Each structure stands twice: as structure tokens, then as C-alpha cells.
Design a protein around this nucleic acid. Structure first.
Lengths: 126, 23, 37, 133, 176, 192, 136, 235
RNA sequence: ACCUCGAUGUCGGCUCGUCGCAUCCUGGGGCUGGAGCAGGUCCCAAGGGUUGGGCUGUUCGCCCAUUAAAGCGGCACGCG
RNA sequence: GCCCCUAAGCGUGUGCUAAGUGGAAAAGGAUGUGCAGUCGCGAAGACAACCAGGAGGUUGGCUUAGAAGCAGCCACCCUU
């Protein structure tokens, strides 16, 4: 667990945030790899997805304007990095939200704006 | 051989200085 | 029980401890439990 | 959640297959008739079938792509696998052939790309040492 | 020491008494009395807690740290809510009945055996094949239930005998 | 390469011999003697711990900068004496050198890689002696063996030396020999 | 077993077991080795019995070196005979060992199986011994 | 040790024969054991056993004993009395002789008169004797037909090459299964310690879910066939 | 080859004991490839018990009937 | 040699021992404790408790019925 690997992660996560527009952050817990393999094919078609450490996010979030999720980094973090239109990956996950109902959305982010769980539902609606 | 051992091992005392007659 | 001068942990679930001045091995499997002496 | 691989047109001997899953409370005869009905089209392979069990004991059986460990054998012409891969090579398979195997294996593999599946067959080819040229 | 670091939370329904090292707690179930080791000292802070104080890092005093914390802890959750253990008996023809302050078993012996009730321990049968033991002292509750559980020599071939609630005992196949 | 010489302190001994040396090693020091082209040997004692740390990092041949009585002095550890049982330094030889001199030094050879599965790598020569500048000694040499077939010999002449160093030892000396994997019967046959 | 082909003198004195070793105190063929720590007369049986022990734990690959050879003979007269009247015929061949001497050496890829193999042979020797490496 | 392993349901077969009859390599080739051999006298001495395997899927105890020599003293026969106890503990006795020799009548005569010494002094019925000629690749075909005509219970084998091993399993099968007693049992619903036993320990014939229970026609081993006699369907 | 050759009586058996435990029976357990009956192996335990005959000077041994068992040793190979 | 027998120290200061070690013993077994130095990790929360995963090719090839991620031998790579 040498620090160099963690240092490279912090740079890469922030650089992917600055390369992407919006995010939708859910709970990854309790989802099979068969589900994880099924979702990653749809996830990677347009967007991207990761399950990283909360503190690794914070040190990779303090640079740019993604510090508007500090109090929401408490719990199972599952970043779904949506690069193009923010509603593509938000529509696919709401399919899985009804498909599974063991996943509950924690929050989301777009255009430098901080939202809530119900706001994210509307984001998937927009 | 307790008798043969307890007699040889009697020589490690302070007053004999590590030696005794008949070992 | 195995009363041997040389008691060693045999499986990966064997714990070696001291109980009343005796080194003994205690395990879930009764075959493994043994004491020194 | 059980598993089997049965020959193409033959089934129901006592040691290998019958009591192998009849010890858990499922069907014994219609499974063989149904298994033959689906594989009569392919008939030239073995199939990993994964019967998924529930409380009601009724079976749910699926048919997968033929194994890469054996689909390579028919592509090369040999019949007996290599006892010493990377020391004595006994089979010949072309990069085109791996693409042919990838075309058959395109449905049930994790590979996202045609060339990526080609790597997977190459990764399996190393486990019995089949020459890829 | 990490176990003994936190303080015991007293509730609203008991009164504590500390006269030196003779700590006694009384409440809605009983009166429990305790003495701690001479290095350790015990007092209470004004925020509804009891605190154990080890003054040294000596091996003796560090072990009496965790021991004292759990003891007072069980002294509190005992005198207020108490403890119960649910016991089961398995095998055909194995029953249990209650004779006032006593218990009667039927475990395949020629003679129906009796188990007396030590003071502060209450027997409460539910069904002929499952019962429970309750009491005020955690040491005494677990003691009598251990004697009860050992009323039959262990049988791994069919599992006949008095067992615990969520037990998974070792078994084996008796073939020949 | 620019090898930064190590700074080590020293004292000049009042008394020598086995009586004075044993007391030195008990007190925590380690005696040594500085000689060379200076033609006047000075009997010094180093701190035992600091000298070991220098040796634990920069190999056996570690260029030293002794401040004996406050005076700078560049030196090179010519030889060492270690007790075979307790594995401690009893004595060291410090040769005095000045920047810009070609010395002759033995350096160790490392082996890196993972050969083909049916081979066993048996290294023959632990060290090899080269000629190098006083402040630019290669601290270790590497022989990467990979993809080699049945028995193949890597002599000294196959070693890639850095710039400005020469192979003093004759290039016919064999260093690394890769041999076929001994058979399960060969272990029985060899040595009876 | 290991025995010399021919020795110039068949009835020799007992080798002197005093002092520390002055040669062969460094492993120079393989990667790992056994370093002695007590004087002993290691017979040819203990040399061969330990050799089989190392082989039975690696079982496939590697080379075992034995830097020690039983040159010296040790004699004994027939039992139930009084003293005097000659010297006994040589019976067992032993090799003088002094502390610091490296006895066996092994060359094996992964260290854990190498060290465990050596510990198997150490438990078949009449001395306390330790495991030493090629490195410093 | 045998008094705890006889309780099990494993058939026991014994291989006997002269020294350098290849009995060790027969067990190696039939199973896959790495027992070492020497082309000399007393190649193997310890009584070696390992599992035996079949064409129809049955395990058994395959026992390798010590090799005999001609003109053996009875002192050495008594000396190795520890190795020859498995002779009477064998369900089937396999005999292997030197197939390249001249007088198969003497090879059977010597060993059989040696073994029946122990059978008589142990007073058990002699086992069904089977002869196996070895080295058919190193033997002359003239003697092959001579024992063909003389011993129909003789089989040609060359364990050094491996011809006819599948026939050996069929011959082994018909003579080991033959000791069992076919049963027609009706196991009730309160004895569910038998459903897996009748399927894997023994051989099933038919099964029907009658009112009285499951009428299980089955074939089971000797300690397992005299064992369901309580629920017999006829006398 | 240290005590005894100006004497330390030598094998078996009988009578009479006394001690050790490295336990044959009886007593308490752990493990078991311990279903039961019966065993195998180890640990704790010296209170009591431990048969009569055929052969040999015999110790020892083999055998015949039994029994819960028919223990091993020391005490000048106990005891003239 | 200095607690009493027994003449003179239940002497002074700093530590160690819990075994009556002191007041017998080996190969070897071992979370008993004091001291000294290292290494990997960690407030970017390392370790313990705990949640959730821990998949595809696949039953990786030879071997016997068979090793199907899990008697034996060889190989031990790849996608999510």
C-alpha cells in the first residue's frame, strides 16, 4: 500500500472530473459482479463508473469545484462519471433503481451545482 | 547414577573454586 | 488429547496459549487439541 | 445452482450423470430428452449447462458456448491435450482461427471487443499450449 | 485498556454507591455488590457515567483495567434488564417439566433427574422441548446453564441432548 | 555517476595491540588503519554503528571522507574483517585516494529475471574485479537472464559495464551458468 | 554412503575438536547454506541422511552441495573384550566440523521452500546450526 | 487397524506370485501408484495397498504382498507371516506367474501348495483362484494356447505394455459383484439414513413409491446385504 | 580392579515380609477410521486383589482347567 | 562469610525474577517478561470487530470413472 499508488489515484480522479461534466453518486453495496459486469457494459458505453475511497475523493476534489459534496461523502461511495449528457447515465441507473431497489441514490453534481436525492431524480428526468 | 552426579557437581561451590579431589 | 513435549499448531485454526503454566493448543477440531508435558 | 457437461447424443449412465444430480431432487429423464433436443443442432461439442434451483425443485437450464479448452482441439486437429505445455507443442491454430472461436464465443464471454476476446482465447490457449501463429 | 477506556453509562433507574473500592448498584431488579483491585480506583463523573482509573502501565494494572470495566458494565445491565438464555432439547422421547422451583428432565435415563434452582435464578419452561433460564447475576446464569447443557454425554451421531439456542454442533456419520 | 562521499569522524588511537583493540570494540568503536601513497599509516577508530550504516547502503566499497582531528581526508575501504560467527566488523583497511585516480576494485554481480521454465540458474562467480575512477565505482553489476534456452554460459565479457570502467579480470571467466532443470532422479543420483 | 577410495593410514588419532573454523566459512556454490555452531564428528550416515531429507522436500529442481567429506576413520574393538592387545579396525568414517563451517548448500527459486528444506536436514544433525544466505 | 477398516464396504483383492513376476508394476499400471521396482530379487518387501478402480465405477482394496522365492524355509514363511495375513482377508486372489518360462504347471503347484498351507491352518474356504500370465510380448505363443486349453480361468497379460486391461476389469467385476446378495427391501419413511446409501453404497435395480413405502429392488455388499433382511418381501 | 582371601557361604524352592510405578484387574477421563456390543491409544491413580495342576534342579518357557486379573521390578539377582 | 542455629549486615543506591528459579540435566517445544536496533503501515484512518462483493472463459490441459477453483503431473495467461 505504498503512497505512490494513492498519489497517482488522486491526480487521475481529479483529472477525470475536470475532463467530465457531471456526476451521479449512488450506493454500490450489495450488488453482484454479474450486476456489476452487466452495468459496466452500459456504464462504459458513454459514461464511466468507479468505486473509490471517500478521502481519496476529497483530496482529488479540493482542487476544482467538486467540494460541494463534503457532507455527502459519508456512506458507500459509488461514482458514476458521466462525461457527455448528464441524463444518459442518470436514466440507465434509474432503470437499475427500479430493477434492484436495493440501490438508493445518495446525490449528484452537474455544472458546479450541488443537489439532493430528489433533485437527482429530476436530473434523470431532465 | 545420582550418587555419582551429586558428588562431581559438588565442586562448583564458592569455597572449592571449581575443583575437588576425585573430580 | 495429545501429551507430547513438542506441541505445535497443525492447522490454520489452531491457537497456542498458556493455561496454568502449561503450553497447550486449542482448536475447533478435537483431534488437534494437545498439551505439553 | 448445479452444473454438468454431457456428451452430444448420449446420456444417462449411473455413476457419471444420473445420481450426480438426482441426489438433490430434480428431474432425471425429461432433462435428457430436452438436452438432446437442443444439442442436435450443434451435436459436435460439449456444453456447460447451469441448472439454477429454487424452492419448487423445477429446473431452469441454459446452454452456453462450447468450451475454449475443447473448441481449440477441433480447430487444430489433435485429440489429446498436451501433458507439457511450453515444452512440447502439439497443436496448430492460426490467429484467424482464434477469431473464428471468438465469433462462436461472442455471446457469453465478458470480452467487450473482438480482439479482446481473441486475447482471452490466447490466454486459454496457453493452458494447454496450442501454437498461435 | 481500550476496553476500559470508555466509561460505563448509568441509567435513570438505578442508584450507585461507591465507598472506596466496594461499589454496589441497586435498581429495579436487585442489589449487586463488587470489589475492585487495589491499584484500580473507581469513581463517577457528574455526566451520568462511572469511570475506572488505572494509575500505571504495569502489566498487572493494565489487565485489571479491562476486567474492571466489563464487570461494572455487566453489573449495570444486569441489575436493570437482566439476562435470559434459551435452551433446547433434541431427540425422540426427550421432554422437560417444571415442579415449582425445580426442573425435571427425561433424557433417556432410567431415572427422571432433577435440577434445583439456585437463588436468584428462575426456571421458566415454554414447551416440553424448549425452555429458558433467567437471573440477575451473569456469572450465576451462565453457570447453571452450563451444568444443564452437560446433562448428556455429547452425541455427534444424532445430536441427542440439551443444546443452546443457535447452536451448530459437530456431527459425523455413524456408518459401521 | 556522481557518488556523494560519506562523512565519517575518526580519532587517532593512543595505544594499539590486542589489549587496546578489544577494549575499543567493547566500548563501541571499530579500529582501522589508513594507508596508501601517503606512506605514513595512521591508526584510527570509527564509530561502529555509523560505519555499518554506510556499508549497509553503499556496499562494501564505500568512499569515505574522514575528518581526522578536523582535517578532511578522502579514503576508500580497502578490506574488511568479520568474525565468522557473530558477524561483526573487527577491523577495516582504509586506502587514501584523491579524485581522478583509477583504482582496481571487486564488485558484486546481481541476477534479475525469470528464465524459461525448464532451467535452473546457478551463479558461479559472486564478484568480478573492475577498474574504475575513485569517485565513480559501480556499486553493483546486473546480468539479466531471460528467454535463454538450455544450457547457456554468460562470462564476464557479456557484462555491460558503465562508461569509463574496464574489466580487469580476463573475459574468459564464467559468471552465470543456466543449466537444465535437474530431474527427479538426478537428485537421487548426485552425491552418493 | 561416502567413503574415500584409499587412505594412506587406516588407524588415525582422534581429530582435535578445539578452536574456531578458519576456512569454508562462506557459502560459495549455491544460494542458501547451513552454518555449524558446535564441534562434532559428523559421520557419513548423518551426511547422507540429511541429503535425502533436502531432496524429499524440493523433489523436482535445484542442486545440493556437500562441502564436507568423511575422510577420518574412527575405530572400535569387538565388544566384550578386555583392554589391550592391539587397536580396533576402522568402522565408521567421520568428518571434523568446527563452528563457522558451512556444511550444505542449496539452490532453489522460492526462499520459503528453500529454508524449510534446510530446516529438515538440520533436524538430522548432532549440532545446533543456523541458516545463512549468500548475501551480506 | 484392519479391525476398523474391515467394517467398511471395500472389496479386497490380493496379488501373489513369484519374485520378479511384475506384481508391483501391475498395481502401478492398474492404478497409477509410483511404487519403485528393481529387476532383481525382493524388489518389494512391505505389504503395500492402494485404491482400486473399475470400468463401472467401483472402488476396492487392492493389496500388494511380499514376493516369494522357491525352496523357501518355513522359518522365513513364519518370519513373513505378518505380510501374508491378507491372503485369507481377500475376496479374490490374483496369481501372476512368469510368462516367459517353461513350466506353468510347476509355478501354480509351488505357490498354491505354499498358500494352502496358510489357508488350512487358518481354516477358511479357499478363494476363487485366478491366474495371470505376464509378458505376452516377451513370451512364445506356443505356451499361450497350451494354457488356453488347460486353464480357461487363465488370461494373457503384458503389464509392461498394457494389452487386455479392460478385460481384466470385466473379469474382476463379475467375480467381485458375485459375492453380494440381491435384496428386495421396503424402507419406510422414519429411516431416512438410507436413501443415499442404497444409491451409492450399493446397486439399484428398480424403485417404486408404493403405499407400504418404497419397494427398493437393489444389490448391496455382504455387510450391506444381510443387513436389510428385516424388511424382506419374501421368506 | 576401589572394600573383604589371619573366610563378605554360591543357584532354585519353602516361610516371612517391605517399598517403587514404567498399572494386569477394579476407579476417573481426552481422542478415535468411537452407530450398539466390543475394542485401539494417551492422561490421572499404588487402596485392595492378582488361582490350582502336567514336564524340567530349574529361574525362564510350553501346556491343561479356570478367573475381574492371573503386572513389572528393588531390598547381598531380600530372606541357609 | 554476616535473618536464627552461628561470630559479624532482617547494610546503602539502581534494576531483573514469580519459577522456591535460587537449591541438578539434553535434542527440541513455547504470545513469560526487561533492554537495544530495524522494517512495512497509518489522521489520504494502517490493525481488530462489522457491511458488501470475492465473477467470465472454466470442468486450464494429461491421469485413472475423477482432481469440476480444491489425491497426482504440466501449464498458471487474459476481459469486466
Amino acid at each position: 500500500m505504498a503512497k505512490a499508488d494513492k498519489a497517482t489515484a488522486v491526480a487521475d480522479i481529479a483529472e477525470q472530473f475536470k475532463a467530465s461534466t457531471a456526476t451521479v453518486v449512488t450506493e454500490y453495496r450489495g450488488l453482484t459482479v454479474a450486476n456489476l459486469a452487466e452495468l459496466r457494459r452500459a456504464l462504459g458505453d458513454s459514461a464511466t463508473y468507479t468505486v473509490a475511497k471517500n478521502t481519496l475523493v476529497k483530496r482529488a476534489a479540493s482542487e476544482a469545484g467538486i467540494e460541494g459534496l463534503d457532507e455527502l461523502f459519508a456512506g458507500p461511495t459509488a461514482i458514476a462519471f458521466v462525461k457527455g449528457e448528464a441524463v444518459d447515465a442518470a436514466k440507465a441507473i434509474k432503470k437499475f433503481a427500479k430493477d434492484n431497489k436495493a440501490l438508493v441514490i445518495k446525490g449528484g453534481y452537474m455544472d458546479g451545482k450541488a443537489l439532493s436525492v430528489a433533485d437527482v431524480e429530476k436530473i434523470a428526468d431532465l | 547414577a545420582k550418587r555419582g552426579r551429586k558428588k562431581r557437581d559438588r565442586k562448583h561451590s564458592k569455597a572449592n573454586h571449581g575443583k575437588r579431589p576425585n573430580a | 488429547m495429545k501429551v507430547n513435549p513438542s506441541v505445535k499448531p497443525i492447522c490454520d485454526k489452531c491457537r497456542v496459549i498458556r493455561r496454568h503454566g502449561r503450553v497447550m493448543v486449542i482448536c475447533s477440531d478435537p483431534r488437534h487439541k494437545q498439551r505439553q508435558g | 445452482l448445479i452444473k454438468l457437461q454431457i456428451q452430444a447424443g448420449q446420456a444417462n449412465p449411473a455413476p457419471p450423470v444420473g445420481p450426480a444430480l438426482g441426489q438433490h431432487g430434480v428431474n432425471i429423464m425429461e432433462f435428457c430428452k430436452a438436452y438432446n433436443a437442443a444439442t442436435e443442432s450443434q451435436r459436435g461439442n460439449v456444453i456447460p449447462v447451469e441448472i439454477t434451483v429454487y424452492e419448487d425443485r423445477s429446473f431452469t437450464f441454459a446452454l452456453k458456448t462450447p468450451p475454449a479448452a475443447k473448441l481449440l482441439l477441433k480447430a487444430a486437429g489433435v485429440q489429446k491435450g498436451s501433458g507439457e505445455p511450453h515444452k512440447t507443442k502439439v497443436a496448430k491454430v492460426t490467429w484467424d482461427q482464434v477469431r473464428e472461436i471468438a465469433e462462436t464465443k461472442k455471446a457469453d464471454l465478458n470480452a467487450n471487443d473482438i480482439d479482446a476476446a481473441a486475447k482471452i482465447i490466447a490466454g486459454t490457449a496457453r493452458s494447454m499450449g496450442i501454437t498461435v501463429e | 485498556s481500550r476496553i476500559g477506556k470508555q466509561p460505563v453509562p448509568v441509567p435513570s433507574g438505578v442508584d450507585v454507591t461507591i465507598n472506596g473500592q466496594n461499589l454496589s448498584v441497586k435498581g429495579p431488579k436487585g442489589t449487586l455488590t463488587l470489589d475492585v483491585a487495589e491499584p484500580i480506583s473507581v469513581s463517577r463523573a457528574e455526566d451520568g457515567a462511572i469511570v475506572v482509573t488505572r494509575p500505571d502501565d504495569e502489566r498487572r494494572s493494565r489487565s485489571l483495567h479491562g476486567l474492571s470495566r466489563t464487570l461494572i458494565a455487566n453489573l449495570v445491565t444486569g441489575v436493570t434488564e437482566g439476562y435470559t438464555q434459551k435452551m433446547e432439547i433434541f431427540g425422540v422421547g426427550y421432554r422437560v417439566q417444571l415442579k415449582g422451583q425445580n426442573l425435571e428432565f427425561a433424557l433417556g435415563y432410567s431415572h427422571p433427574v432433577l435440577i434445583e434452582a439456585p437463588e436468584g435464578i428462575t426456571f421458566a419452561v415454554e414447551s416440553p422441548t424448549k425452555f429458558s433460564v433467567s437471573g440477575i447475576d451473569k456469572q450465576k446464569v451462565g453457570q447453571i446453564s452450563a451444568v444443564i447443557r452437560r446433562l448428556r454425554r455429547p452425541d455427534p451421531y444424532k445430536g441427542k441432548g440439551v443444546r443452546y439456542e443457535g447452536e451448530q454442533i459437530r456431527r459425523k456419520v455413524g456408518k459401521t | 555517476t556522481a557518488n556523494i562521499p560519506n562523512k565519517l569522524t575518526a580519532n587517532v588511537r593512543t595505544r594499539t595491540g590486542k589489549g587496546a583493540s578489544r577494549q575499543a570494540r567493547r566500548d563501541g568503536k571499530v579500529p582501522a588503519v589508513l594507508y596508501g601513497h601517503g606512506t605514513d599509516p595512521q591508526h584510527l577508530e570509527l564509530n561502529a554503528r555509523d560505519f555499518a550504516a554506510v556499508l549497509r547502503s553503499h556496499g562494501t566499497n564505500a568512499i569515505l571522507t574522514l575528518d581526522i582531528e578536523g582535517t578532511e581526508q578522502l579514503a576508500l575501504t580497502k578490506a574488511l574483517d568479520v568474525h565468522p560467527i557473530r558477524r561483526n566488523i573487527q577491523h577495516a583497511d582504509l586506502l587514501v585516494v584523491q579524485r581522478g585516480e583509477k583504482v582496481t576494485v571487486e564488485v558484486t554481480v546481481l541476477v534479475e529475471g525469470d528464465a524459461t521454465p525448464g532451467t535452473l540458474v546457478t551463479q558461479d562467480a559472486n564478484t568480478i574485479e573492475i577498474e574504475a575512477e575513485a569517485l565513480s565505482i559501480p556499486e553493483q553489476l546486473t546480468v539479466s537472464v531471460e528467454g535463454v534456452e538450455a544450457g547457456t554460459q554468460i562470462t564476464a565479457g557479456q557484462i555491460s559495464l558503465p562508461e569509463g570502467v574496464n574489466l580487469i579480470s580476463d573475459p574468459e571467466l564464467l559468471v552465470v551458468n543456466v543449466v537444465e532443470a535437474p530431474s527427479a532422479e538426478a537428485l537421487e543420483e548426485e552425491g552418493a | 554412503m561416502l567413503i574415500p577410495r584409499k587412505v594412506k593410514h587406516r588407524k588415525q588419532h582422534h581429530p582435535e575438536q578445539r578452536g574456531i573454523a578458519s576456512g569454508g566459512t562462506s557459502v560459495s556454490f549455491g544460494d542458501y547454506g547451513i552454518q555449524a555452531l558446535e564441534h562434532a564428528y559428523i559421520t557419513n550416515r548423518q551426511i547422507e541422511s540429511a541429503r535425502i531429507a533436502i531432496n524429499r522436500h524440493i523433489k523436482r529442481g535445484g542442486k545440493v552441495w556437500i562441502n564436507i567429506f568423511p575422510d577420518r576413520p574412527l575405530t572400535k574393538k569387538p565388544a566384550e573384550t578386555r583392554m589391550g592387545s592391539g587397536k580396533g579396525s576402522p568402522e565408521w568414517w567421520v568428518a571434523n566440523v568446527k563452528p563457522g563451517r558451512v556444511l550444505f548448500e542449496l539452490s532453489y527459486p522460492d526462499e520459503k521452500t528453500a529454508r524449510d528444506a534446510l530446516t529438515r536436514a538440520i533436524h538430522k544433525l548432532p549440532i545446533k546450526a543456523r541458516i545463512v544466505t549468500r548475501e551480506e | 487397524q484392519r479391525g476398523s477398516r474391515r467394517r467398511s464396504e471395500i472389496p479386497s483383492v490380493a496379488i501373489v506370485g513369484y519374485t520378479n513376476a511384475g506384481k508391483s508394476s501391475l498395481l502401478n499400471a492398474l492404478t497409477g501408484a509410483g511404487v519403485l521396482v528393481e529387476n532383481a530379487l525382493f524388489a518389494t518387501l512391505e505389504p503395500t495397498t492402494r485404491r482400486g478402480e473399475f470400468e463401472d465405477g467401483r472402488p476396492f482394496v487392492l493389496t500388494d504382498t511380499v514376493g516369494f522365492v522357491r525352496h523357501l524355509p518355513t522359518q522365513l514363511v513364519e518370519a513373513f507371516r505378518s505380510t501374508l495375513e491378507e491372503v485369507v482377508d481377500a475376496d479374490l486372489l490374483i496369481h501372476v506367474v512368469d510368462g516367459s518360462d517353461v513350466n506353468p504347471l510347476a509355478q501354480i503347484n509351488a505357490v498354491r501348495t505354499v498358500i494352502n498351507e496358510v489357508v488350512a491352518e487358518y481354516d477358511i474356504a479357499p478363494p476363487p483362484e485366478l491366474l495371470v500370465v505376464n509378458k505376452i510380448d516377451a513370451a512364445t505363443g506356443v505356451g499361450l494356447a497350451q494354457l488356453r486349453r488347460a486353464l480357461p480361468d487363465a488370461v494373457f497379460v503384458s503389464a509392461r505394455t498394457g494389452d487386455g486391461l479392460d478385460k481384466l476389469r470385466s473379469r474382476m467385476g463379475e467375480l467381485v459383484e458375485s459375492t453380494d446378495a440381491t435384496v428386495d427391501v421396503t424402507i419406510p419413511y422414519d429411516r431416512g439414513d438410507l436413501v443415499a446409501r442404497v444409491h451409492t453404497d450399493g446397486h439399484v435395480d428398480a424403485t417404486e413409491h408404493t403405499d407400504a413405502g418404497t419397494r427398493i429392488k437393489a444389490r448391496v455388499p455382504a455387510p450391506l446385504a444381510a443387513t436389510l433382511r428385516e424388511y424382506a418381501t419374501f421368506a
